[PDB]
Design an enzyme around this catalytic site. Structure first.
Site, mmCIF file in Angstrom:
data_model
loop_
_atom_site.group_PDB
_atom_site.id
_atom_site.type_symbol
_atom_site.label_atom_id
_atom_site.label_comp_id
_atom_site.label_asym_id
_atom_site.label_seq_id
_atom_site.Cartn_x
_atom_site.Cartn_y
_atom_site.Cartn_z
ATOM 1 N N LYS A 73 -15.342 5.331 9.557
ATOM 2 C CA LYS A 73 -13.892 5.475 9.513
ATOM 3 C C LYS A 73 -13.627 6.899 9.070
ATOM 4 O O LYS A 73 -14.212 7.387 8.136
ATOM 5 C CB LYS A 73 -13.210 4.476 8.581
ATOM 6 C CG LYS A 73 -11.690 4.666 8.549
ATOM 7 C CD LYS A 73 -10.897 3.486 7.998
ATOM 8 C CE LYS A 73 -10.780 3.546 6.500
ATOM 9 N NZ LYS A 73 -9.986 2.416 5.948
ATOM 10 N N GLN A 103 0.921 0.137 1.981
ATOM 11 C CA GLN A 103 0.041 -0.912 1.451
ATOM 12 C C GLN A 103 0.804 -2.081 0.852
ATOM 13 O O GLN A 103 0.439 -3.245 1.093
ATOM 14 C CB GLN A 103 -0.949 -0.360 0.417
ATOM 15 C CG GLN A 103 -1.888 0.709 0.938
ATOM 16 C CD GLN A 103 -2.448 0.421 2.332
ATOM 17 O OE1 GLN A 103 -3.023 -0.654 2.618
ATOM 18 N NE2 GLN A 103 -2.384 1.419 3.170
ATOM 19 N N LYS A 113 -7.389 10.293 -10.539
ATOM 20 C CA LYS A 113 -6.261 9.436 -10.242
ATOM 21 C C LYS A 113 -6.467 8.041 -10.774
ATOM 22 O O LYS A 113 -7.427 7.377 -10.430
ATOM 23 C CB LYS A 113 -6.035 9.368 -8.758
ATOM 24 C CG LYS A 113 -4.731 8.675 -8.404
ATOM 25 C CD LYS A 113 -4.904 7.848 -7.145
ATOM 26 C CE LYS A 113 -3.566 7.525 -6.488
ATOM 27 N NZ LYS A 113 -3.061 6.328 -7.177
HETATM 28 N N1 LIG Z 1 -8.028 0.302 -2.176
HETATM 29 C C1 LIG Z 1 -8.051 0.558 -0.858
HETATM 30 O O1 LIG Z 1 -8.841 0.031 -0.080
HETATM 31 C C2 LIG Z 1 -7.001 1.445 -0.290
HETATM 32 C C3 LIG Z 1 -6.763 1.390 1.084
HETATM 33 C C4 LIG Z 1 -5.717 2.151 1.600
HETATM 34 C C5 LIG Z 1 -4.990 2.992 0.762
HETATM 35 N N2 LIG Z 1 -5.241 3.037 -0.552
HETATM 36 C C6 LIG Z 1 -4.484 3.901 -1.464
HETATM 37 O O2 LIG Z 1 -3.292 3.260 -1.871
HETATM 38 C C7 LIG Z 1 -2.352 4.254 -2.244
HETATM 39 C C8 LIG Z 1 -1.060 4.002 -1.491
HETATM 40 O O3 LIG Z 1 -1.255 4.100 -0.077
HETATM 41 P P1 LIG Z 1 0.010 3.824 0.886
HETATM 42 O O4 LIG Z 1 -0.493 3.728 2.337
HETATM 43 O O5 LIG Z 1 0.873 2.706 0.418
HETATM 44 O O6 LIG Z 1 0.835 5.218 0.757
HETATM 45 P P2 LIG Z 1 2.437 5.345 0.778
HETATM 46 O O7 LIG Z 1 2.822 6.817 0.614
HETATM 47 O O8 LIG Z 1 3.033 4.658 2.008
HETATM 48 O O9 LIG Z 1 2.872 4.514 -0.522
HETATM 49 C C9 LIG Z 1 2.830 5.158 -1.808
HETATM 50 C C10 LIG Z 1 4.110 4.841 -2.582
HETATM 51 O O10 LIG Z 1 3.905 5.058 -3.973
HETATM 52 C C11 LIG Z 1 5.105 5.612 -4.548
HETATM 53 N N3 LIG Z 1 4.775 6.202 -5.861
HETATM 54 C C12 LIG Z 1 4.229 7.394 -6.122
HETATM 55 N N4 LIG Z 1 4.071 7.523 -7.458
HETATM 56 C C13 LIG Z 1 4.538 6.405 -8.043
HETATM 57 C C14 LIG Z 1 4.665 5.885 -9.421
HETATM 58 N N5 LIG Z 1 4.256 6.622 -10.465
HETATM 59 N N6 LIG Z 1 5.213 4.657 -9.593
HETATM 60 C C15 LIG Z 1 5.614 3.911 -8.528
HETATM 61 N N7 LIG Z 1 5.532 4.331 -7.260
HETATM 62 C C16 LIG Z 1 4.999 5.541 -6.979
HETATM 63 C C17 LIG Z 1 5.610 6.560 -3.489
HETATM 64 O O11 LIG Z 1 6.981 6.860 -3.753
HETATM 65 C C18 LIG Z 1 5.340 5.704 -2.242
HETATM 66 O O12 LIG Z 1 6.443 4.806 -2.023
HETATM 67 C C19 LIG Z 1 -2.998 5.583 -1.944
HETATM 68 O O13 LIG Z 1 -3.612 6.057 -3.119
HETATM 69 C C20 LIG Z 1 -4.061 5.259 -0.941
HETATM 70 O O14 LIG Z 1 -5.134 6.213 -0.918
HETATM 71 C C21 LIG Z 1 -6.224 2.282 -1.093
HETATM 72 O O1 LIG Z 2 -10.606 2.947 1.936
HETATM 73 C C1 LIG Z 2 -9.663 3.600 2.409
HETATM 74 O O2 LIG Z 2 -9.317 3.567 3.586
HETATM 75 C C2 LIG Z 2 -8.802 4.479 1.497
HETATM 76 C C3 LIG Z 2 -8.795 5.831 2.106
HETATM 77 C C4 LIG Z 2 -8.130 6.823 1.198
HETATM 78 C C5 LIG Z 2 -8.791 6.879 -0.166
HETATM 79 C C6 LIG Z 2 -9.764 5.712 -0.379
HETATM 80 N N1 LIG Z 2 -9.242 4.430 0.094
#
Ligand SMILES: NC(=O)c1ccc[n+]([C@@H]2O[C@H](COP(=O)([O-])OP(=O)(O)OC[C@H]3O[C@@H](n4cnc5c(N)ncnc54)[C@H](O)[C@@H]3O)[C@@H](O)[C@H]2O)c1
Ligand SMILES: O=C(O)[C@@H]1CCCCN1
Ligand SMILES: NC(=O)c1ccc[n+]([C@@H]2O[C@H](COP(=O)([O-])OP(=O)(O)OC[C@H]3O[C@@H](n4cnc5c(N)ncnc54)[C@H](O)[C@@H]3O)[C@@H](O)[C@H]2O)c1
Ligand SMILES: O=C(O)[C@@H]1CCCCN1
Lengths: 346, 354
Positions: free
Chosen positions: A77, A149, A240
């Site tokens: 990916k 998410q 983070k």
């Molecule tokens: N664990 C996993 O497998 C996985 C998978 C995908 C993404 N992620 C992570 O999840 C996070 C979110 O991804 P996403 O696609 O929803 O992005 P996104 O930008 O669509 O959503 C992020 C949201 O968080 C808000 N935000 C920022 N700081 C904040 C705070 N202090 N309090 C509350 N809200 C806050 C933003 O305003 C935004 O609405 C990222 O860090 C991304 O890397 C993790």
């Molecule tokens: O597993 C994933 O897709 C995300 C990508 C961005 C940072 C790590 N988590």
């Protein structure tokens, strides 16, 4: 011989043909089984992933996430975390693709969208952990961060728990305002609520925020419910974090990928010896989670390539069912293997 | 809410058209010119070597490696070459040993903007790299080219070197009789006379040699340590696994050795065999200040080539420019970009027939 490509429109057709609920459930099922296999020692966690940090317009990271099935295929990916994308460009923060390569020959056999797939498998992983660690009569979901998410977090969880409402917060008012609309298909009502209220009233919480390095926590260490389960989902850069330390130290914490979480997840704030069994172990032996639904629990989610391989498989089977996709001869496979310039005219 | 972004894909038919439209020679020359300028830039400190690439060892059918090769130009774009070394491929599947694709991602958004065949491209920039090093380190009147390994790489080694040196003959060997026997046919388009010759004769006669073999770990050298011409330059091209080498130690220790990517060469190239003090200045240094190659033409030299993603980026740009001019390739919406950025489920089905 050719590469099978599923684009944005094929992915839309897959979801239509299967149904959003059924597709999510499929992925939840496949994740559950795969994780059990890892937990039995029959498959391995993906290796640590690599990445390139990006400063502008705000800090992000672009990553490659390999997972090898020896003798069948390699999944990679490629995915960006670019948290200025929605406001600056109308693009998802998480932007990626998932490629399949034949392991014996190296050939690129399939390529598809990573955006939907990432959201689905990430929501699924939370559902897996939440089936084990949240009370099965959980009715109130809390969401901190209401971007992309959050949607599949709510969706996935609504499928394994009798959720009646979601209380939600985002630091961008427009993003928390639009969440009810984005959530409405799931039938769970939505109410905007500050982090302290969410902490106090939720049965299960997912945090999935683009918070900056060093700017946590996104959920304050107030009183929580005794039985609270938190899916800690946000994770991009080192440094983070989303949860407060005092909360982590009192919790039963399981990681998706312990080595990765100790570096990039909430477990950055803990030492290894303080982690409960990893998620794969719990899947392989659920009785090991036995009393934890009723006490404070944290699933430290970071994402790893195996989850993407599994989800991509689900997509490919559905697309095969309905022959979706195009086939493109991308690679130059000269009939003369030994001639770079044997370019093919018949 | 920006212009709908899609991925520009150049498949095998498109790369074939580029070659046909630009011409082989002109295309290779372009790649050599762009590699040359870029290496000089690295040598001046204006750009950086690609970071170490990553890779997954495979045992079966014979030991091989599958690698990912990133290069990032900040605020511009990221290139990633995904590529397999699978040396049983030709003789077990009728496929190229080296099988790959090259993808470009926007650095600002992460979007996949382009994707193309890696096979031809790898072969071209790899021949081009040897041309670059050979202009610097071979005698400019070099007439006799040696080739050990007469597979895919051999073809572009000859081609690229034929454009920068007055090559009259190519003396060629492969441990597989079928592969050396077909070589003349594959090389014909260069005009250079080919004869099959054993490694000892190639060593004794050549002005410049390229080694480009799928020799297995521990089974070198592919060229014996037995007397060469004083001015010989070798482009040592074969490289895959740690423990894979092509040249005799003794010979390397008599040579001015330059690496494409020292950190990488010290682990995966001929310089695996060498301690770091036995390396001369890297290729980028030589390109930026050719005088530092002074006198090296007339004595034994070795270019330890391993390949790095910067070379693939530059080659890909040449290809994209030519494809843009000639209107080639297709546009595919691969990534899902929902109308609402925050809604994974805001999906667009195929519009209905009208
Ligand atoms: N664990 C996993 O497998 C996985 C998978 C995908 C993404 N992620 C992570 O999840 C996070 C979110 O991804 P996403 O696609 O929803 O992005 P996104 O930008 O669509 O959503 C992020 C949201 O968080 C808000 N935000 C920022 N700081 C904040 C705070 N202090 N309090 C509350 N809200 C806050 C933003 O305003 C935004 O609405 C990222 O860090 C991304 O890397 C993790
Ligand atoms: O597993 C994933 O897709 C995300 C990508 C961005 C940072 C790590 N988590
Ligand atoms: N440095 C770079 O930038 C770069 C780029 C591409 C490929 N490579 C490497 O170059 C090597 C060759 O690649 P290819 O595409 O030509 O593979 P190929 O399979 O097309 O050609 C390999 C040839 O080597 C022959 N061989 C094996 N052992 C030999 C020996 N001891 N003596 C003579 N011939 C022998 C095989 O018979 C075969 O004909 C590989 O190690 C590959 O990983 C390097
Ligand atoms: O730079 C390259 O393309 C090759 C790929 C295979 C082994 C390493 N060298």
């Amino acid at each position: 011989m050719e590469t099978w490509v599923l684009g944005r429109r094929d992915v839309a057709e897959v979801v239509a043909a299967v149904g959003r609920d059924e597709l999510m459930r499929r992925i939840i099922d496949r994740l559950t089984g795969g994780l059990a296999e890892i937990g039995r020692g029959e498959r391995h966690l993906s290796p640590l992933r690599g990445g390139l940090e990006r400063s502008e317009p705000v800090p992000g990271i672009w990553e490659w996430m390999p997972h090898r099935e020896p003798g069948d295929h390699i999944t990679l990916k490629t995915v960006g975390y670019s948290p200025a994308n929605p406001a600056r460009f109308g693009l998802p923060t998480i932007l990626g693709t998932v490629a399949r390569y034949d392991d014996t020959t190296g050939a690129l056999t399939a390529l598809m969208d990573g955006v939907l797939l990432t959201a689905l498998r990430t929501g699924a992983a939370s559902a897996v952990a939440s089936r084990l660690l949240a009370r099965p009569d959980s009715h109130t979901l809390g969401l901190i961060g209401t971007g992309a998410q959050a949607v599949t977090q709510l969706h996935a969880l609504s499928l394994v728990l009798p959720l009646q409402r979601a209380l939600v917060w985002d630091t961008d008012p427009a993003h928390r305002e639009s969440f009810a609309r984005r959530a409405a298909f799931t039938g769970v009502s939505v109410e905007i609520a500050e982090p302290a209220r969410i902490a106090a009233e939720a049965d299960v919480i997912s945090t999935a925020t683009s918070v900056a390095v060093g700017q946590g926590p996104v959920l304050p260490d107030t009183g929580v419910r005794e039985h609270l389960h938190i899916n800690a989902v946000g994770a991009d850069l080192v440094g983070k974090t989303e949860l407060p330390l005092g909360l982590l130290e009192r919790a039963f914490v399981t990681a998706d990928h312990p080595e990765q979480a100790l570096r990039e997840g909430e477990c950055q704030q803990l030492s290894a010896d303080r982690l409960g069994p990893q998620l794969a172990h719990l899947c392989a032996d659920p009785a090991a989670a036995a009393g934890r639904q009723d006490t404070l629990s944290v699933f430290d989610s970071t994402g790893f390539a195996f989850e993407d391989a599994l989800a991509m498989e689900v997509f490919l089977e559905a697309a095969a069912e309905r022959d979706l996709g195009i086939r493109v001869g991308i690679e130059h496979h000269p009939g003369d293997a030994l001639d770079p310039y044997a370019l093919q005219p018949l």
